[PDB]
């Protein structure tokens with residue numbers, strides 16, 4: 001529903017994670033966890049650290 005901004009480059013470390021580039025605009029899918037948010041990066045879905053993204 002919401003959009004988030006990738007504040008840093010982040011390379012996924014596990015299958016459930018996804019990679020993002022600084023400045024990417026991600027779709028926020030699930031932010032119920034305080035440390036890991038599920039996002040859509042382009043056509044991929046996965047988790048990134050909440051600390052590395054900013055809600056828009």
Ligand code: NA
Pocket residue numbers: 012013014015016017018046
């Ligand atoms: Na992955």
Ligand code: NA
Pocket residue numbers: 050051052053054055
């Ligand atoms: Na954040």
